Short mmCIF file of C-alpha atoms and ligand atoms in Angstrom, two decimals:
data_model
loop_
_atom_site.label_atom_id
_atom_site.label_comp_id
_atom_site.label_asym_id
_atom_site.label_seq_id
_atom_site.Cartn_x
_atom_site.Cartn_y
_atom_site.Cartn_z
CA UNK A 1 -0.29 -0.20 -0.33
CA UNK A 2 1.47 3.63 -0.75
CA UNK A 3 2.24 5.40 1.96
CA UNK A 4 1.53 9.22 2.70
CA UNK A 5 3.42 10.94 6.09
CA UNK A 6 4.43 14.05 6.68
CA UNK A 7 8.00 14.71 8.65
CA UNK A 8 7.96 17.40 11.56
CA UNK A 9 4.44 17.08 12.21
CA UNK A 10 5.58 17.95 16.09
CA UNK A 11 6.55 21.50 14.53
CA UNK A 12 3.71 21.91 12.55
CA UNK A 13 1.14 21.04 14.70
CA UNK A 14 3.01 24.05 16.94
CA UNK A 15 2.19 26.44 14.15
CA UNK A 16 -1.68 25.12 13.98
CA UNK A 17 -2.05 25.23 17.24
CA UNK A 18 -2.08 29.44 16.52
CA UNK A 19 -3.10 29.37 13.13
CA UNK A 20 0.02 29.70 10.53
CA UNK A 21 0.44 31.92 8.89
CA UNK A 22 2.41 31.91 5.06
CA UNK A 23 3.98 35.47 3.48
CA UNK A 24 3.68 35.74 -0.04
CA UNK A 25 5.11 38.51 -1.94
CA UNK A 26 5.10 40.10 -5.61
CA UNK A 27 8.44 37.62 -6.67
CA UNK A 28 7.53 34.59 -4.22
CA UNK A 29 9.00 33.81 -0.63
CA UNK A 30 9.66 30.54 0.06
CA UNK A 31 7.96 28.14 3.29
CA UNK A 32 8.92 27.38 6.50
CA UNK A 33 8.20 25.16 7.85
CA UNK A 34 8.89 23.30 4.09
CA UNK A 35 6.56 20.28 3.57
CA UNK A 36 8.92 17.29 4.10
CA UNK A 37 6.78 13.71 3.09
CA UNK A 38 7.58 10.48 4.20
CA UNK A 39 6.80 8.46 0.94
CA UNK A 40 6.89 4.49 0.85
CA UNK A 41 5.34 1.39 -0.78
CA UNK A 42 6.24 2.66 -4.36
CA UNK A 43 7.37 0.50 -7.76
CA UNK A 44 11.29 1.20 -6.42
CA UNK A 45 11.38 0.66 -10.46
CA UNK A 46 8.47 2.67 -11.63
CA UNK A 47 8.65 5.90 -12.79
CA UNK A 48 6.23 9.21 -10.60
CA UNK A 49 6.86 12.94 -10.70
CA UNK A 50 5.37 14.86 -7.20
CA UNK A 51 3.16 17.82 -8.02
CA UNK A 52 2.32 20.15 -4.69
CA UNK A 53 -0.47 22.26 -4.90
CA UNK A 54 -2.98 24.25 -2.27
CA UNK A 55 -6.30 23.93 -1.54
CA UNK A 56 -9.17 26.82 -0.37
CA UNK A 57 -9.87 25.63 3.13
CA UNK A 58 -13.08 27.30 3.18
CA UNK A 59 -14.39 30.34 0.18
CA UNK A 60 -14.05 33.15 3.08
CA UNK A 61 -11.45 36.23 3.68
CA UNK A 62 -9.45 36.21 7.31
CA UNK A 63 -8.72 39.15 8.88
CA UNK A 64 -6.84 39.27 12.28
CA UNK A 65 -9.60 40.97 14.57
CA UNK A 66 -8.13 42.37 18.45
CA UNK A 67 -5.35 39.27 18.15
CA UNK A 68 -7.93 36.59 16.73
CA UNK A 69 -8.36 35.53 12.76
CA UNK A 70 -12.07 35.95 12.04
CA UNK A 71 -13.60 34.62 8.21
CA UNK A 72 -15.44 37.52 6.58
CA UNK A 73 -18.69 37.00 5.68
CA UNK A 74 -19.47 36.75 2.00
CA UNK A 75 -17.36 33.71 0.45
CA UNK A 76 -16.57 34.11 -2.77
CA UNK A 77 -15.61 30.81 -5.17
CA UNK A 78 -12.22 30.02 -4.89
CA UNK A 79 -10.58 28.82 -8.15
CA UNK A 80 -7.99 26.32 -8.04
CA UNK A 81 -4.11 27.00 -7.66
CA UNK A 82 -1.84 26.30 -10.06
CA UNK A 83 0.65 22.57 -9.20
CA UNK A 84 4.34 22.97 -8.55
CA UNK A 85 6.27 20.20 -10.20
CA UNK A 86 8.67 19.00 -8.24
CA UNK A 87 12.28 19.83 -9.72
CA UNK A 88 14.01 15.97 -8.87
CA UNK A 89 10.33 15.39 -11.26
CA UNK A 90 10.66 12.85 -12.57
CA UNK A 91 11.98 9.90 -10.82
CA UNK A 92 12.16 7.03 -10.16
CA UNK A 93 10.20 5.33 -6.62
CA UNK A 94 13.84 4.54 -5.09
CA UNK A 95 14.86 8.20 -5.37
CA UNK A 96 11.72 9.58 -3.97
CA UNK A 97 11.28 6.33 -0.77
CA UNK A 98 15.62 7.13 -0.03
CA UNK A 99 15.05 10.57 1.97
CA UNK A 100 11.72 12.97 2.29
CA UNK A 101 10.73 14.93 -0.87
CA UNK A 102 11.38 18.19 0.55
CA UNK A 103 9.23 21.08 -0.97
CA UNK A 104 12.22 23.93 -0.33
CA UNK A 105 11.97 25.84 -4.08
CA UNK A 106 8.26 26.54 -3.85
CA UNK A 107 7.73 30.17 -4.06
CA UNK A 108 4.50 32.13 -2.95
CA UNK A 109 2.97 34.40 -4.65
CA UNK A 110 -0.07 37.41 -4.43
CA UNK A 111 0.63 37.96 -8.60
CA UNK A 112 0.41 36.59 -11.29
CA UNK A 113 4.14 35.42 -12.78
CA UNK A 114 6.04 34.11 -15.23
CA UNK A 115 6.76 30.67 -13.63
CA UNK A 116 7.69 28.67 -10.95
CA UNK A 117 6.19 30.65 -8.17
CA UNK A 118 2.77 30.06 -6.77
CA UNK A 119 -0.22 32.32 -6.29
CA UNK A 120 -2.59 32.77 -3.47
CA UNK A 121 -4.93 34.77 -2.53
CA UNK A 122 -4.19 36.94 0.51
CA UNK A 123 -6.09 36.52 3.27
CA UNK A 124 -7.27 33.11 2.73
CA UNK A 125 -6.59 29.83 3.96
CA UNK A 126 -5.00 27.50 2.40
CA UNK A 127 -4.79 23.45 3.06
CA UNK A 128 -1.26 21.94 1.31
CA UNK A 129 -2.09 18.58 -0.73
CA UNK A 130 0.42 16.56 -2.89
CA UNK A 131 -0.31 14.44 -6.06
CA UNK A 132 2.37 11.35 -7.14
CA UNK A 133 1.41 10.54 -10.57
CA UNK A 134 2.59 7.51 -12.56
CA UNK A 135 4.39 8.20 -15.31
CA UNK A 136 5.75 6.69 -18.46
CA UNK A 137 4.37 3.31 -17.75
CA UNK A 138 1.51 2.38 -19.64
CA UNK A 139 -0.84 2.46 -16.91
CA UNK A 140 -0.67 6.31 -15.73
CA UNK A 141 -2.10 6.64 -11.99
CA UNK A 142 -2.70 9.85 -9.63
CA UNK A 143 -2.78 9.23 -5.24
CA UNK A 144 -3.67 12.64 -3.75
CA UNK A 145 -2.92 13.41 -0.28
CA UNK A 146 -3.35 16.34 2.08
CA UNK A 147 -2.06 18.12 5.30
CA UNK A 148 -4.20 19.35 7.30
CA UNK A 149 -1.35 20.00 9.52
CA UNK A 150 0.56 22.12 7.27
CA UNK A 151 -2.95 24.62 6.97
CA UNK A 152 -2.38 28.15 6.91
CA UNK A 153 -3.06 31.79 5.84
CA UNK A 154 -1.61 33.54 3.02
CA UNK A 155 -0.28 36.80 4.75
CA UNK A 156 1.90 39.90 3.27
CA UNK A 157 2.90 40.42 6.69
CA UNK A 158 3.14 38.34 9.73
CA UNK A 159 -0.06 39.24 12.15
CA UNK A 160 0.39 36.77 15.16
CA UNK A 161 3.75 37.68 16.90
CA UNK A 162 3.61 33.95 18.28
CA UNK A 163 3.87 32.66 14.49
CA UNK A 164 6.97 35.45 14.17
CA UNK A 165 8.48 33.95 16.72
CA UNK A 166 8.39 30.10 16.49
CA UNK A 167 9.05 30.85 12.89
CA UNK A 168 12.40 32.93 13.93
CA UNK A 169 13.02 30.62 16.73
CA UNK A 170 12.98 27.10 14.78
CA UNK A 171 14.69 28.54 10.83
C1 LIG B 1 -0.92 21.44 -14.78
O1 LIG B 1 -0.42 20.77 -15.49
C2 LIG B 1 0.24 19.36 -13.88
C3 LIG B 1 1.48 18.99 -14.39
O2 LIG B 1 2.69 19.37 -14.54
N1 LIG B 1 2.00 17.72 -15.12
C4 LIG B 1 2.48 17.01 -14.72
C5 LIG B 1 2.79 15.55 -14.66
C6 LIG B 1 3.73 14.91 -14.65
C7 LIG B 1 5.12 15.10 -14.56
C8 LIG B 1 5.13 16.17 -15.13
N2 LIG B 1 6.34 17.04 -16.12
C9 LIG B 1 7.75 17.11 -14.93
C10 LIG B 1 8.94 17.54 -15.23
O3 LIG B 1 8.30 15.86 -14.13
C11 LIG B 1 4.47 17.41 -15.30
#
């Protein structure tokens, strides 16, 4: 059985219990913590690409009001995010299973951008999601996995200083 697990869930849960925030910039900002995924049960000899996207967890705009995140009252449908191709793709199962798959080079932006960078809407709440695509083979296959522990609100600057402090303490 294909098993997908979160590396350093310990640390992600500290961020999550405070409400996690990720900076987005016009040029694109890398994530901290970095999404690292433990993968077992692939065919060592089969070929796979790892894809990352961000699901809008709800349809609302969020605001930091008197030290607390609170949703707007006017939902709008959230067009799905673009997909980030893990730069080590495509690769043998063996490659993906020999160390945690680390999305250290994805950059989060607030502006439609040349390439690489993934555009998010600021003050929306996002749930990271990967797709493992079996490629080259006759029988194309996709397995998807969500990481609730890694939810965050996209922000142009940090609102909750407890987050600012965790980010610095653990970077
Ligand atoms: C929007 O389409 C999503 C996508 O990028 N698919 C996709 C699937 C499998 C492999 C690759 N490309 C590499 C470089 O491995 C791309």
